[PDB]
Write an enzyme that holds these catalytic residues in place. Structure first.
Site, PDB file in Angstrom:
ATOM      1  N   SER A 200       0.829  -1.202   0.000  1.00 54.18           N
ATOM      2  CA  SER A 200       0.000   0.000   0.000  1.00 54.18           C
ATOM      3  C   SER A 200       0.879   1.275   0.000  1.00 54.18           C
ATOM      4  CB  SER A 200      -1.017  -0.053   1.164  1.00 54.18           C
ATOM      5  OG  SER A 200      -1.151   1.194   1.837  1.00 54.18           O
ATOM      6  N   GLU A 325      -8.899  -5.667  -4.502  1.00 57.31           N
ATOM      7  CA  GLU A 325      -8.283  -4.435  -4.010  1.00 57.31           C
ATOM      8  C   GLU A 325      -9.277  -3.413  -3.483  1.00 57.31           C
ATOM      9  OE1 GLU A 325      -5.326  -3.775  -3.340  1.00 57.31           O
ATOM     10  OE2 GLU A 325      -4.093  -5.290  -4.352  1.00 57.31           O
ATOM     11  N   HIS A 438      -7.442  -5.922   0.384  1.00 59.34           N
ATOM     12  CA  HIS A 438      -6.209  -5.166   0.515  1.00 59.34           C
ATOM     13  C   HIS A 438      -5.523  -5.437   1.850  1.00 59.34           C
ATOM     14  CE1 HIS A 438      -3.900  -1.707  -0.908  1.00 59.34           C
ATOM     15  NE2 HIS A 438      -3.919  -1.195   0.312  1.00 59.34           N
TER      16      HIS A 438
HETATM   17  C1  LIG Z   1     -13.340   7.130  10.480  1.00 54.45           C
HETATM   18  O1  LIG Z   1     -13.140   8.246   9.646  1.00 54.45           O
HETATM   19  C2  LIG Z   1     -12.752   7.891   8.354  1.00 54.45           C
HETATM   20  C3  LIG Z   1     -11.908   6.808   8.185  1.00 54.45           C
HETATM   21  C4  LIG Z   1     -11.506   6.445   6.822  1.00 54.45           C
HETATM   22  C5  LIG Z   1     -10.611   5.336   6.360  1.00 54.45           C
HETATM   23  C6  LIG Z   1      -9.967   4.450   7.169  1.00 54.45           C
HETATM   24  C7  LIG Z   1      -9.099   3.395   6.516  1.00 54.45           C
HETATM   25  C8  LIG Z   1      -8.926   3.357   5.203  1.00 54.45           C
HETATM   26  C9  LIG Z   1      -9.643   4.336   4.363  1.00 54.45           C
HETATM   27  O2  LIG Z   1      -9.536   4.345   3.157  1.00 54.45           O
HETATM   28  O3  LIG Z   1     -10.467   5.275   4.964  1.00 54.45           O
HETATM   29  C10 LIG Z   1      -8.052   2.297   4.565  1.00 54.45           C
HETATM   30  C11 LIG Z   1      -7.113   1.769   5.643  1.00 54.45           C
HETATM   31  O4  LIG Z   1      -6.286   2.837   6.060  1.00 54.45           O
HETATM   32  C12 LIG Z   1      -6.189   0.654   5.099  1.00 54.45           C
HETATM   33  C13 LIG Z   1      -7.006  -0.363   4.322  1.00 54.45           C
HETATM   34  C14 LIG Z   1      -5.196   1.172   4.083  1.00 54.45           C
HETATM   35  O5  LIG Z   1      -5.320   2.239   3.517  1.00 54.45           O
HETATM   36  C15 LIG Z   1      -4.006   0.364   3.739  1.00 54.45           C
HETATM   37  C16 LIG Z   1      -3.611  -0.656   4.538  1.00 54.45           C
HETATM   38  C17 LIG Z   1      -4.352  -1.041   5.841  1.00 54.45           C
HETATM   39  C18 LIG Z   1      -3.312  -1.188   6.932  1.00 54.45           C
HETATM   40  C19 LIG Z   1      -4.949  -2.441   5.707  1.00 54.45           C
HETATM   41  C20 LIG Z   1      -5.358   0.088   6.246  1.00 54.45           C
HETATM   42  O6  LIG Z   1      -4.592   1.136   6.795  1.00 54.45           O
HETATM   43  C21 LIG Z   1      -6.271  -0.409   7.336  1.00 54.45           C
HETATM   44  C22 LIG Z   1      -7.081   0.719   7.968  1.00 54.45           C
HETATM   45  C23 LIG Z   1      -7.959   1.369   6.871  1.00 54.45           C
HETATM   46  C24 LIG Z   1      -9.185   0.514   6.591  1.00 54.45           C
HETATM   47  O7  LIG Z   1      -8.483   2.526   7.418  1.00 54.45           O
HETATM   48  C25 LIG Z   1     -12.093   7.327   5.818  1.00 54.45           C
HETATM   49  C26 LIG Z   1     -12.925   8.379   6.150  1.00 54.45           C
HETATM   50  O8  LIG Z   1     -13.402   9.140   5.060  1.00 54.45           O
HETATM   51  C27 LIG Z   1     -14.347   8.459   4.248  1.00 54.45           C
HETATM   52  C28 LIG Z   1     -13.212   8.629   7.398  1.00 54.45           C
HETATM   53  O9  LIG Z   1     -14.071   9.673   7.817  1.00 54.45           O
HETATM   54  C29 LIG Z   1     -13.921  10.971   7.273  1.00 54.45           C
END
Ligand SMILES: COc1cc(-c2cc3c(c(=O)o2)C[C@]2(O)[C@@]4(C)C(=O)C=CC(C)(C)[C@]4(O)CC[C@@]2(C)O3)cc(OC)c1OC
Ligand SMILES: *[C@@H]1O[C@H](CO[C@@H]2O[C@@H](C)[C@@H](O)[C@@H](O)[C@@H]2O)[C@@H](O[C@@H]2O[C@H](CO)[C@@H](O)[C@H](O)[C@H]2NC(C)=O)[C@H](O)[C@H]1NC(C)=O
Ligand SMILES: *[C@@H]1O[C@H](CO[C@@H]2O[C@@H](C)[C@@H](O)[C@@H](O)[C@@H]2O)[C@@H](O[C@@H]2O[C@H](CO)[C@@H](O)[C@H](O)[C@H]2NC(C)=O)[C@H](O)[C@H]1NC(C)=O
Ligand SMILES: COc1cc(-c2cc3c(c(=O)o2)C[C@]2(O)[C@@]4(C)C(=O)C=CC(C)(C)[C@]4(O)CC[C@@]2(C)O3)cc(OC)c1OC
Ligand SMILES: *[C@@H]1O[C@H](CO)[C@@H](O)[C@H](O)[C@H]1NC(C)=O
Lengths: 530, 535
Positions: A200, A325, A438
């Site tokens: 990522s 993904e 993912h």
């Molecule tokens: C709670 O508040 C919010 C949280 C998110 C939010 C959280 C989030 C992701 C994501 O794309 O959006 C993807 C993510 O980060 C991953 C899927 C990621 O990107 C890559 C790898 C892992 C580790 C699996 C992750 O970090 C795991 C943790 C993830 C799911 O957490 C989005 C918001 O806007 C819609 C929001 O509110 C405004």
């Protein structure tokens, strides 16, 4: 006193710890400081090398996690908690970890360097899923992972200013890579065979180091798992970076760049974190507030430009994606989605979903997405709309940026290997409709299934062992293949061959979603320019 | 004198001819004048009704073909010659033909009215392939077909002007339909059961009669074969028609560019017909395929708005329509203008010839639009495969010009109250002389619909004779009842609807039901592309 757990590095002396695996022991040095704590006046500034210390640093436990937002969408749920910080948060977080075979190798061993992902706003090297002990034992590499600053701490940018230049989390990574050049030999590592790997935002980071000459001298091979520096989420322009930095200042009650950064420096770290999400310009999925900025410095142009104009002879790269993904991101912003139902959305939710999934494009651009991704014989079928919106988000953000990178790199001199990871972990706690989401190839690459105290099947263990062998073969030779017996061919822009990684033997296939990626990579940019 | 071969219509008396057909005799009245000859001062003007005559007009053979270009790309080749004029060219060409059963029907019989295609620049009702004797024999309908002016003689327009208002070829068609209302009863026909049918430009003409109220009163049902009034080739706007009229006049020395319309037209009227014909192809704005110089013009009069807008805004309750396409709509057109194509080789084009063919196949759109076409028609796993490229160019042209306009028409008519039946014609005639790669080209269902395989002198197989009989049956059933289905254990032809989008395959095997008239392809042409052209 165990002499294998005493090492001296340029800055001083370290004490490690012996760790058990089912294959035998491993030596680990955890929480080695590589920079001065980026605190107080140092917040937002490039990292400074750690000054030498007297006495012995205790390197037996993981150090603090860099300040970051903590997920609370499903409190207590394994699927979210496994990614959350497992140590206290602190701005004093610039530490790295080294795992080495036991007893320490006495000759130059190839080095794997892990960069964690998490949207540039989260992640930690201490997470269970990134435990290096199994790879090191099984494949006899040295393994290094570092913490780097995330969120505003690592990526807030007021471009042009000396007080918040941006990309400092990337400089944290470079600095750790410099540390490896200078010190890994003291652990048995060979500074002349360093393979970077990341998933990522970690993969996007790996790609960025490929494209930045002061980093390119610090490693030899690259692995990019479900991420690419040219991903539409992975960078922002100077203007939008300035705007976001400015909106963060106003949300926390600060007002000239100098006065703005100085006021930001007086704010408790948690206060900046509490406003993470609030600076994005529109409701979205797969978008993060503070990411690497293109300002001519770390990146002298956009990664797309740097990629097209690069000569990549002498590079070997391994890249790939999971089977689904997009699915994970839909539960964090697409209307109608939840982990707790089948998320069988309506046509109207699919359409509102597309605006969220492809934020900041014209209505014409969105219509073209809807056209490409609608089955016009079944325009309104919930299950197809669910799969289609997952495809939209996954293709746009991951698959097609990766395909583009792989195509360009292979056509410009690099040897590229591509995979699709198609195994759903028996232990997976996200619903079945998410398929292989993912992030869920990682536990297999790190051989987590070998941990007895976990619930993986015998087949899954064997699978993890295959994958560690591919990855380590690649680190050692630039080629994942075992001696002849089903072979993994290089990816080229014409044949476009990649393999499926699951329980069955390697199967060779053609085209990383070639029809869809034609849309995102060839057509859509033209549309956006007119 | 034979009473069966003698008929009195509003204009005076007619004498016809008795034709042999393999199933029994038919009465034919060929070459009935329906308008005053559009000659001299009447060139470019709306048709005048034929003045009454004394005595008896012999309607015993086809009259002249309206002046038109004559294809010479493959001289003497059957595939081209079958479409070429088979009577002498003349501006004196406004005659229609009636076939009726022998003996003449006692009770009022449903009428089929044929309207030939040929791009609005060519065609004639006298062609062998449009011989109505077999339909009338097999199915006991009355068949009518008419000549109408084509090329500049039919469709040159200086909009606004009295002297060349445009659309007179369509007015020719309309006058013929009025003649059918007034006179078909004299032949035993039912003026309250009139079904129009046409192929290519004829199908488009049929559609225009649907969309134009003074025409709409003259028939009850419609059949559009491989054509639609909303086709991108089938109409032009007023400015483009004016530009084309003006460039033609300029190419033949009128005026001695533009000026008084009355004067320009008067100068055009002094030119020999053949002089106009020789310059016909030369007024098109770019090098192109499936484009024709003089076509119906959207001017507020015959067509109060674009056919697109009229289709969208119309109420079609009370209407039954039968529509369809052949299997390979685009192939024929490629040998008439796309680089690398020939009837005499496999036309295995390169990628570069494919890109160039796209510009010609989709003329006068933006570069971005052309790019969108290339994206949707390239297989990105085999972007350079010559056979695939040939096929995909055929699809570009077929989908853009025929399949997608017909699908859009069908969907809109169904959604808005019409009973609609749809087909794809998949049989390639055993006698077809075009190369194998063209598959089932545009125009090659007609001979089956008209029953031509029953003609002993021709060498069709016995299965084809059976097939032709089946087709004539569906068409006639449709003409009689508004429904092609047999009034048994036979597979049923279901209505076409905007949601299910069911149609049948027409060939030697029985009816197979399928869904979607190239639905993925057509969503691009009908939904996305127009939005892109706006922006
Ligand atoms: C709670 O508040 C919010 C949280 C998110 C939010 C959280 C989030 C992701 C994501 O794309 O959006 C993807 C993510 O980060 C991953 C899927 C990621 O990107 C890559 C790898 C892992 C580790 C699996 C992750 O970090 C795991 C943790 C993830 C799911 O957490 C989005 C918001 O806007 C819609 C929001 O509110 C405004
Ligand atoms: C599937 O769930 C979504 C999201 O719902 C949350 O989790 C559910 C299991 C249940 O506890 C809901 O009440 C929760 O909101 C459903 O979408 C929501 O619909 C409500 C109105 O009914 C709306 O207020 C929310 O904003 C919606 N949430 C989102 C993310 O759009 C969805 O309807 C469920 N699908 C079904 C029942 O088929
Ligand atoms: C397929 O034919 C086209 C058109 O050509 C005619 O018929 C052929 C059987 C052969 O006898 C040709 O010489 C005829 O002209 C070929 O395209 C033409 O090439 C000539 C010069 O060689 C050129 O001047 C024309 O413009 C071309 N015609 C086009 C582009 O429509 C085509 O190359 C043939 N394909 C083959 C041989 O594979
Ligand atoms: C030789 O001069 C030229 C001729 C054509 C040309 C001739 C032509 C057609 C066509 O699309 O374009 C289609 C055609 O008319 C049919 C296929 C048709 O439209 C419908 C039905 C039938 C009867 C089968 C047809 O009329 C039969 C006759 C056809 C093939 O003849 C195009 C040119 O420009 C590239 C050109 O050069 C300027
Ligand atoms: C065109 O010329 C004629 C004379 O030959 C004249 O009667 C007519 O009114 C003129 N029309 C216009 C619009 O000038």
């Amino acid at each position: 006193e165990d002499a294998e757990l005493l090492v001296t590095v340029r800055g001083g002396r370290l004490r490690g710890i012996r760790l058990k695996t089912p294959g035998g022991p491993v030596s680990a040095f955890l929480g080695i400081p590589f920079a001065e704590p980026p605190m107080g006046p140092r917040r937002f500034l490039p990292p400074e090398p750690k000054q030498p210390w007297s006495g012995v640093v205790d390197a037996t436990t993981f150090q603090s996690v860099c300040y970051q937002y903590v997920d609370t969408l499903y409190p207590g749920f394994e699927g979210t908690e496994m990614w959350n910080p497992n140590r206290e948060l602190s701005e004093d977080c610039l530490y790295l970890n080294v795992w080495t075979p036991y007893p320490r190798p006495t000759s130059p061993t190839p080095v794997l360097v892990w960069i964690y992902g998490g949207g540039f706003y989260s992640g930690a090297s201490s997470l269970d899923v990134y435990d290096g002990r199994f790879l090191v034992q099984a494949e006899r590499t040295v393994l290094v992972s570092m913490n780097y600053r995330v969120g505003a701490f690592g990526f807030l940018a007021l471009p042009g200013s000396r007080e918040a230049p941006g990309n400092v989390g990337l400089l944290d990574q470079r600095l750790a890579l410099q540390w490896v050049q200078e010190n890994v030999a003291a652990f048995g590592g060979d500074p002349t065979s360093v393979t970077l790997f990341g998933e990522s935002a970690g993969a996007a980071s790996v790609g960025m180091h490929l494209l930045s000459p002061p980093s390119r001298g610090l490693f030899h091979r690259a692995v990019l798992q479900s991420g690419a520096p040219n991903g539409p989420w992975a960078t922002v322009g100077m203007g939008e970076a300035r705007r976001r930095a400015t909106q963060l200042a106003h949300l926390v009650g600060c007002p000239n760049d100098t006065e703005l950064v100085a006021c930001l420096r007086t704010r408790p770290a948690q206060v900046l974190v509490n406003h993470e999400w609030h600076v994005l310009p529109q409701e979205s999925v797969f978008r993060f507030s503070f990411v690497p900025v293109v300002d001519g410095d770390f990146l002298s142009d956009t990664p797309e430009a740097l990629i097209n104009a690069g000569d990549f002879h002498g590079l070997q790269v391994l890249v790939g994606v999971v089977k689904d993904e997009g699915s994970y991101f839909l539960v964090y912003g697409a209307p109608g989605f939840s982990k707790d139902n089948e998320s069988l959305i309506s046509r109207a939710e699919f359409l509102a979903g597309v605006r969220v999934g492809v934020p900041q494009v014209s209505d014409l651009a969105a219509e073209a997405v809807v056209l490409h991704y609608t089955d016009w014989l079944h325009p309104e079928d919930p299950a197809r709309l669910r799969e289609a919106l997952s495809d939209v988000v996954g293709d746009h953000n991951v698959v097609c940026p990766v395909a583009q990178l792989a195509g360009r790199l292979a056509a410009q001199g690099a040897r590229v290997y591509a995979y699709v990871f198609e195994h759903r972990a028996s232990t997976l706690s996200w619903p079945l409709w998410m398929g292989v989401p993912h992030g869920y190839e990682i536990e297999f690459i790190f051989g987590i299934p070998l941990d007895p105290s976990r619930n993986y099947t015998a087949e899954e263990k064997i699978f993890a062992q295959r994958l560690m062998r591919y990855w380590a073969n690649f680190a050692r030779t630039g080629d994942p293949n075992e001696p002849r017996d089903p072979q993994w061919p290089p990816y080229t822009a014409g044949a476009q061959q990649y393999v499926s990684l699951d329980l069955r033997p390697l199967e060779v296939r053609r085209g990383l979603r070639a029809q869809a990626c034609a849309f995102w990579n060839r057509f859509l940019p033209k549309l956006l320019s007119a």
